[model samples]
Target: KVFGRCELAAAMKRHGLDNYRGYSLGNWVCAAKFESNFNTQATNRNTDGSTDYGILQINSRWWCNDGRTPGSRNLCNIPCSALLSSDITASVNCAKKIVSDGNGMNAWVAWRNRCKGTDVQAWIRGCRL
Candidate 1:
């Protein structure tokens, strides 16, 4: 199913995100579009042969069952299922939590910025939220 802006907004609300915080629904959509194209089952192989999976691109192999299990770990590990079952906003919130213990959306901001430049650390600083 295609995720819409309202769905993402509602998901974000579920995860305690009250506002877009200078970012717009379109921005979030763009991030998802570039990262995994909003595919809950998306995955990628790192240079080290590790794997990052799911809509939020949570690294299942690193954070989950080391590729032994079929799905992502829960809160105890990577919280893959939580992200998969969540809406767009919830998924984004989950990603944010994974990045900085829920402090800010630096991970996503950095990812989005990476699309524009090679300096990831610098892009993270430029993120508004």
Candidate 2:
């Protein structure tokens, strides 16, 4: 399922991503926008043979185990398939773990290239957060 900008923003906020680890809700929304375009079913296969799954594009190599990625750590301790649903709670939790792991939002290259150091408030301007 694809989410509208405000819909996704509101959902992220509801899941406790707002101001998480000093990053604003807009940063989270902007990263998700670029990572998966708010599509729950989105997946990306990296050149290293790792797959990034779902909206936040949590990687199989380090986060979720897909049973195929070589040397997967599964630090998130969940199956990769758990992220590919419209119900984003699992993805949101995994993302929080990623941040808590000291990776911050920079764990995602999309966030690094597209959202980092930018004025992200536009991502959630009218959303009544």
Candidate 3:
């Protein structure tokens, strides 16, 4: 399931992502736009044998346990499958944990390359916040 822009914004905000670790809801929406295009089922297998899951692309090695990622820490304590579901509760929770990892929003390379230091306000443009 793909989420609309406003829908994503509202969801992230409701889940307490707005201004989390100094990153606004727009920053998260921008990262999600580039990371998975708002697709809940998105998955990217990294060269290091780890997989990124869901709209936020939580990683298997450091966050989720996919049962196949070598040396996975499962820091999110969530199954990778949960991230792919449209519910997004576990995904949002894991993302919050990831942001609290001391690196802040830089935990996502997509955020660094696209949203970091950029005007992400447009990501939430016209949305009633």
Residue 40 of model 2 has an lDDT of: 95
lDDT of 2 by residue, 1-129 (tens): 999999999899998999999999999999999999999999999988999999999999999999999989999899999999899999999999999887688888999999999999989998876
Which structure is stronger by TM-score: 1 or 3? 3
RMSD of each: 7.3, 0.8, 0.7
Per-candidate local distance difference test: 0.49, 0.93, 0.93
- lDDT (0-100) at residue 97 of candidate 3? 91
The TM-score of candidate 2 is: 0.97
Error of model 3, residue 32, in angstroms: 0.5
Alpha-carbon TM-score of each model against the true structure: 0.52, 0.97, 0.97
Q: Which candidate is the best by TM-score?
A: 3
Model 3 TM: 0.97
Steric clash pairs (candidate 2): none
Residue 61, model 2, lDDT: 96
Worst 10 residues of 3 by lDDT: 15-24
